[PDB]
Design a protein around this motif. Structure first.
Motif, PDB file in Angstrom:
ATOM      1  N   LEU A   1      43.760  28.941 -15.018  1.00  0.00           N
ATOM      2  CA  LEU A   1      45.002  29.648 -14.767  1.00  0.00           C
ATOM      3  C   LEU A   1      44.709  30.978 -14.070  1.00  0.00           C
TER       4      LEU A   1
ATOM      5  N   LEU B   1      46.055  32.003 -10.430  1.00  0.00           N
ATOM      6  CA  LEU B   1      46.803  33.241 -10.255  1.00  0.00           C
ATOM      7  C   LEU B   1      46.156  34.110  -9.187  1.00  0.00           C
TER       8      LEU B   1
ATOM      9  N   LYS C   1      46.732  32.583  -5.726  1.00  0.00           N
ATOM     10  CA  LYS C   1      48.121  32.845  -5.345  1.00  0.00           C
ATOM     11  C   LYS C   1      48.268  34.294  -4.881  1.00  0.00           C
TER      12      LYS C   1
HETATM   13 CL   LIG Z   1      50.226  29.176 -11.289  1.00  0.00          CL
END
Ligand SMILES: [Cl-]
Ligand SMILES: [Cl-]
Ligand SMILES: [Cl-]
Ligand SMILES: [Cl-]
Ligand SMILES: [Cl-]
Ligand SMILES: [Cl-]
Ligand SMILES: [Cl-]
Ligand SMILES: [Cl-]
Lengths: 44, 40
Positions: A6, A10, A13
């Motif tokens: 995760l 993140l 992104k």
């Molecule tokens: Cl995500």
């Protein structure tokens, strides 16, 4: 595991949005210069 | 680590909002430039 993955996703992104933002900023600046030029043109 | 996730998320949120605003600006400016071009 899931949390680290995760975090990775993140961060990726985030990197993407940062690049996208810099590009958009560049575009805004370009357009602003163009508009300003044409307005100075209209002022004659 | 939970902190890291939280801060990452926050930063991300900020960047998303920034991109939204900037995109809006590019739209506005594109409309404007188009108008002023059609004018000249
Ligand atoms: Cl995500
Ligand atoms: Cl990248
Ligand atoms: Cl873009
Ligand atoms: Cl530029
Ligand atoms: Cl002027
Ligand atoms: Cl932890
Ligand atoms: Cl706007
Ligand atoms: Cl254009």
């Amino acid at each position: 595991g899931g949390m680290k993955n995760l975090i990775a996703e993140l961060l990726f992104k985030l990197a993407q949005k940062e690049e996208e933002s810099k590009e958009l900023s560049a575009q805004v600046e370009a357009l602003e210069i163009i508009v300003t030029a044409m307005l100075r043109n209209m002022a004659q």
